[PDB]
Amino acid sequence: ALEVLFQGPHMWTISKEYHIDEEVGFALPNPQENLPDFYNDWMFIAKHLPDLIESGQLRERVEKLNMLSIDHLTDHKSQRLARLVLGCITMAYVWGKGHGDVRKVLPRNIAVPYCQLSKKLELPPILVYADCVLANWKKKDPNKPLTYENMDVLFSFRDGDCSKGFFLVSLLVEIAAASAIKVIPTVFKAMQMQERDTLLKALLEIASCLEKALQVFHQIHDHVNPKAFFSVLRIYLSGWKGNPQLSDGLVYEGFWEDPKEFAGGSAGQSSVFQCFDVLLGIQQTGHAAQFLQDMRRYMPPAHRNFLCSLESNPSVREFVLSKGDAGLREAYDACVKALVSLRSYHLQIVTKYILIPASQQDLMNFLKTVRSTTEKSLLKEG
Amino acid sequence: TISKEYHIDEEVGFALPNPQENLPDFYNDWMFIAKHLPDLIESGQLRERVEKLNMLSIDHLTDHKSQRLARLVLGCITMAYVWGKGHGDVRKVLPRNIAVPYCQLSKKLELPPILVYADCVLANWKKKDPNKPLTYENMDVLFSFRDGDCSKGFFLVSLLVEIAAASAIKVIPTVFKAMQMQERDTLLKALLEIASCLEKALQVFHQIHDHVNPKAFFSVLRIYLSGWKGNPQLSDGLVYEGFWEDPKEFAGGSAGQSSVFQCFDVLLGIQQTAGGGHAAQFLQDMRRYMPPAHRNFLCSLESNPSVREFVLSKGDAGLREAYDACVKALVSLRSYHLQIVTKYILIPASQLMNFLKTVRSTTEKSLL
Ligand code: HEM
Ligand code: HEM
Ligand SMILES: O[C@@H](c1cn(-c2ccccc2)nn1)c1c(C2CC2)sc2cncn12
Ligand SMILES: O[C@@H](c1cn(-c2ccccc2)nn1)c1c(C2CC2)sc2cncn12
């Protein structure tokens, strides 16, 4: 960071200041399962959101809370758990049973420490992908590997909402894509040094990682069901930006005067997918371009910094295009075709889990626009 | 010192140092129109002169300084074409012979195909006498839109403020190195030096009253500075004929595109681009309208540790007082700016503010 100010933007190494783990990548490694005893009143509500919502007792338990100070959350891992705890509670409070009865005012005893801890971590006071995906997980047995069977989420909204399935499959894909992040400094160093064979090997390794990530994504069908995702999980993931149910935003009582509008949790907030579009020169950032640029403001600041540092580095696409090297172009296209495959598989999933259940009781245009931009980035056709 | 890759000058800072006054003879057809925009617009001959142009290739613009002059030339012509005499008759289609090389040269420089602060302020200037100093008397702009539009006054005062603020940019590496090295006295000296520079920049800003007038700014210059993003006059954007199929929407020139003012908010931890407000979104978007090296510098400043969090964590009154000197100087600049926008915009309209008051409020709320 100091050396980039003096010698210029050059990603010869991935700095610890970017908060990318060698193993989990953009995910929070080994998230905290428990908070200090001082916050047991928050932890009780968050760990019992399904029963509290169903019994109609949730809003009362939130309203009858004492305002706890965020000063007892010393380290980042505990501040991130608190963010996930308060975030999950806020969604449950605002949406309730999830059938029309909204709450446009968040109680001061929860809204004050929430916006305080949110300001500390530079994140909006709404549940984000970094909370319910990147920090909402644990290993059942630490010695066993990071697989679905050896993992669990920390919080759910309703019984049978498929929260574990949806969040853990997204996380397992994040970790699969993370192995290609280690290859990024190799790409920039080989471009600077003009090591063509090294760059080719690096581009093929990134493609190999994104191909393995598509295989991981097939597990969605075994852990999520269309009725539960559309009818239940979708509601608790909804935000208050451009929403007819909370047209002016949410009142963060004791923190802001007027209601504030924030976008709901979105996989458009995933730092790993945005960093491959940046790396490969896919100019993703129209409505889709604006949405993805905005979703960076919903990512952890170290990850938001990593994305802009990747944009400050030379273009891998322009470099490949300028070399008149078929093997290098074929390797670059392997990376692009792996992203097109992921986006195309994703559209198939959104048809099964959103488009079809909706017919049996937009965002399709966003995903088709993203995929179209990825496919139009190929040099030789796919 | 800050890397040469950031394109910050020791003297002018974010401004383009010694901008090129003339383009190669191959582009004399562009230069004739641009240098005669006041007469060509008034006579109604400008749109015809643009439509009767041959499509020139951008390949004869070899170095950056000439590519930036071409961007200023094509940009000024584009505003004059779209807005014409500036009284309702808009042009929703930009001719292929100008729109094609404009979007081509814009793609090269990573800038949108619309006139930006980097064109009409940072690269739209010359020294009357090179040996004399960089003062109003010894300076002039390269292009104007209409006679009596106060283009020289508005653009040169903005530029003179940019250069006044530039002297505090040299102090930035000193701040970060002293935080890393834990040199408290060095950090205090550096914070006071930055405050000194932002105090001197407020003095420079007073010249606006001597070189701009409310009637000419509101009635004339404002029109040519207007863009096509959220504009009821070009609701769908502009057609860049021979480059894009559908009309594209781009924001007009804005001092929100100044890299020097954004870098002091980043340095001092004023979260201007946070909260999800209209002001936070606008300032984040305006980074896409800055030269990429300057956009990279802003990002590099964000990647560095927080000076505000560091000062807050030390329980050091002298250090907090020095940090607050920097913040109070930015509040003073923003408050003086609001006074100017009342005289030059709010009052002439009776015969924007919410954005500037939201920015200033965020700066004041940052005091310790
Ligand atoms: C139950 C299955 C899934 C459904 C119904 C689903 C739905 C959606 C929707 C509606 C969006 C649009 C953005 C928004 O409005 O929030 C989106 C975007 C996205 N999703 Fe999924 N998703 C599923 C599984 C996954 C998984 C497992 C991943 C892996 C991390 C993933 C990665 C992405 C990415 C990266 C985007 C951003 C746009 C893009 O870059 O393609 N999705 N998803
Ligand atoms: C004739 C006098 C001036 C008027 C009427 C004026 C007007 C405005 C307006 C309307 C905006 C809002 C952004 C937009 O809509 O584009 C703005 C922003 C701004 N102006 Fe001025 N301006 C004047 C002089 C100056 C000068 C001389 C400077 C010095 C560089 C300056 C610096 C700024 C900055 C930095 C912003 C961005 C917001 C902020 O950080 O405070 N202005 N100005
Ligand atoms: O973007 C989120 C989302 C939004 N909808 C959605 C469903 C129906 C109607 C409207 C919207 N579904 N999922 C999302 C994740 C949440 C945890 C952050 S994880 C992930 C992977 N793909 C999408 N998402
Ligand atoms: O922000 C720009 C602006 C916007 N308006 C404006 C006036 C009336 C109604 C709406 C908008 N005036 N100026 C601006 C500069 C443009 C040339 C790049 S230079 C500078 C210094 N202070 C502000 N600006």
Curated annotation (Swiss-Prot), chain B:
Pathway: Amino-acid degradation; L-tryptophan degradation via kynurenine pathway; L-kynurenine from L-tryptophan: step 1/2. It comes from the Eukaryota. Activity is inhibited by and MTH-trp (methylthiohydantoin-DL-tryptophan), modestly inhibited by L-1MT (1-methyl-L-tryptophan) but not D-1MT (1-methyl-D-tryptophan). One of its GO terms (biological process) is quinolinate biosynthetic process. Expressed in mature dendritic cells located in lymphoid organs (including lymph nodes, spleen, tonsils, Peyers's patches, the gut lamina propria, and the thymic medulla), in some epithelial cells of the female genital tract, as well as in endothelial cells of term placenta and in lung parenchyma. Weakly or not expressed in most normal tissues, but mostly inducible in most tissues. Expressed in more than 50% of tumors, either by tumoral, stromal, or endothelial cells (expression in tumor is associated with a worse clinical outcome). Not overexpressed in tumor-draining lymph nodes. The keyword Cell inner membrane does not apply. It catalyses: D-tryptophan + O2 = N-formyl-D-kynurenine; L-tryptophan + O2 = N-formyl-L-kynurenine. One of its GO terms (cellular component) is smooth muscle contractile fiber. GO terms for molecular function: electron transfer activity; heme binding; indoleamine 2,3-dioxygenase activity; metal ion binding; tryptophan 2,3-dioxygenase activity. Binds 1 heme group per subunit. In the active form, the heme iron is in its ferrous state Fe(+2). The catalytic cycle does not alter the oxidation state of the heme, but IDO1 is prone to autoxidation. Keywords: Cytoplasm, Dioxygenase, Heme, Immunity, Iron, Metal-binding, Oxidoreductase, Tryptophan catabolism. Its cofactor is heme b. InterPro entries: Indolamine_dOase (IPR000898), Trp/Indoleamine_2_3_dOase-like (IPR037217). It is found in: Cytoplasm, Cytosol. Its main location: cytoplasm. Pfam families: IDO (PF01231). Heme b binds at H337. Induction: By IFNG/IFN-gamma in most cells. Exogenous inflammatory stimuli induce the expression of IDO1 in antigen-presenting cells such as dendritic cells, macrophages and B-cells. Its EC number is 1.13.11.52. Belongs to the indoleamine 2,3-dioxygenase family. IDO1 is the target for therapy in a range of clinical settings, including cancer, chronic infections, autoimmune and allergic syndromes, and transplantation. Monomer. Catalyzes the first and rate limiting step of the catabolism of the essential amino acid tryptophan along the kynurenine pathway. Involved in the peripheral immune tolerance, contributing to maintain homeostasis by preventing autoimmunity or immunopathology that would result from uncontrolled and overreacting immune responses. Tryptophan shortage inhibits T lymphocytes division and accumulation of tryptophan catabolites induces T-cell apoptosis and differentiation of regulatory T-cells. Acts as a suppressor of anti-tumor immunity. This is Indoleamine 2,3-dioxygenase 1. The gene is IDO1.
